[PDB]
Design a protein around this nucleic acid. Structure first.
Length: 369
RNA sequence: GCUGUGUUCGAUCCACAGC
């Protein structure tokens, strides 16, 4: 679905809210499987590690707002308990540091927060105005004021064609995954899973579903390497594709930082990779490595809401094992009308990444009929 | 310019993609 998340969380309803998503997934999946899904719960609050807010000016008072889904009307928000405690503390600080500093305040229309379990933060202040050395001066005092307070925090100043990194635009996550810690660089404006608690569990579920697998793994559009770097434990080698250049950078750093040897990141789109597979095309960039030398019986896929397009649909059907994580079971099911013809559902999970909303995250392991 | 995207609401405003 497409619900909003409210300032007040009906935590008393968490369990009922979940139960309905469980029964919902079950109906949706019925045409393809009779499996009783595995179900992973979110903590009932402070689960969301990034939040964005429009800012509203009330004369000299200003404040973050969200918008009512149905009516479009403006809701003033002093806290946001769905967001991490750190995002909460930074919400108060930011309004404090800007309230009566007119260069920081003027034309300040939204604030983006990015937060980690490891306790780092990246706050972006967006403007309908040009930014200059005067802005940069005051903005520099605000960060030291914040740091002053023991907040590991960077600041990004944005306006049209403008991006002032106080120092930088990434932070480093530390996630405990199946015993071993795990570093993940995360870049502002590049996709990350918003629910870190749920993320740990998707990683872990993927790790269990691909246990004792023979050979190699192929991941498409792997972002900062999230799943690939974890799954590298279960596979002799990993080949992971990504086009977005800061994601590729982050993913590269993430291999180094985790001392991983068995994963190669390839800067390639799905279409011009499959060309390298079936058919040929002597690639400028692949030159370093030999595809025929690799043996991928498992393909991994985690698309946006829209899901797999028809081309990709066909492409993954090539493989004996498909691992598909979704943030929209509706499109997973569309996909599955096709995928079910060639594959059976081996495993099934719900992940409650978006509590108190209609959205559902989930996962499926499909093996060739 | 135009279209599309952004895995909470939300963005002809911030960003990205395609053209």
């Amino acid at each position: 679905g497409s619900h909003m998340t409210p300032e007040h969380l009906p935590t008393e309803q968490y369990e009922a809210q979940l139960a309905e998503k469980v029964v919902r997934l079950q109906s949706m999946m019925a045409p393809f499987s009779d499996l009783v899904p595995e179900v992973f719960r979110s903590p009932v609050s402070h689960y969301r590690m990034r939040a964005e807010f429009r800012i509203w000016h009330d004369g000299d008072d200003l404040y973050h707002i969200i918008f009512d889904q149905q009516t479009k009307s403006r809701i003033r928000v002093d806290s946001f308990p769905a967001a991490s405690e750190l995002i909460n503390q930074l919400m108060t600080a930011m309004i404090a540091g800007v309230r009566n500093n007119p260069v920081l305040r003027h034309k300040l229309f939204q604030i983006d927060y990015l937060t980690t379990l490891s306790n780092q933060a990246v706050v972006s202040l967006l403007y309908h105005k040009k930014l200059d050395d005067e802005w940069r001066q005051e903005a520099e005092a605000l960060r030291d004021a914040l740091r002053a307070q023991n907040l590991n925090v960077h600041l990004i100043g944005r306006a049209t064609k403008t991006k002032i990194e106080l120092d930088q635009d990434y932070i480093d996550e530390r996630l405990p995954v199946a015993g071993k810690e795990m570093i993940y660089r995360q870049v502002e404006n590049s996709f990350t899973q918003p629910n870190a608690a749920m993320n740990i569990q998707m990683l872990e579920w993927a790790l269990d579903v691909t246990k004792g697998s023979k050979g190699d793994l192929l991941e498409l559009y792997c972002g900062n390497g999230n799943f690939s770097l974890a799954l590298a434990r279960n596979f002799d080698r990993v080949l992971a594709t990504e086009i977005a250049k800061p994601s590729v950078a982050a993913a590269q750093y993430n291999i180094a930082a985790n001392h991983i040897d068995n994963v190669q990141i390839i800067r390639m789109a799905a279409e011009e990779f499959t060309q390298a597979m079936n058919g040929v095309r002597e690639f400028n960039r692949l030159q370093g490595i030999d595809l025929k030398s690799y043996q991928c019986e498992t393909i991994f896929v985690d698309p946006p809401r829209s899901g797999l397009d028809s081309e990709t649909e066909k492409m993954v059907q090539a493989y004996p094992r498909i691992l598909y994580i979704s943030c929209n079971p509706e499109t997973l099911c569309k996909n599955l009308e096709t995928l079910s013809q060639t594959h059976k559902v081996e495993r099934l999970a719900l992940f409650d990444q978006f509590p108190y909303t209609h959205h559902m995250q989930c996962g499926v392991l499909l093996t060739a009929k």
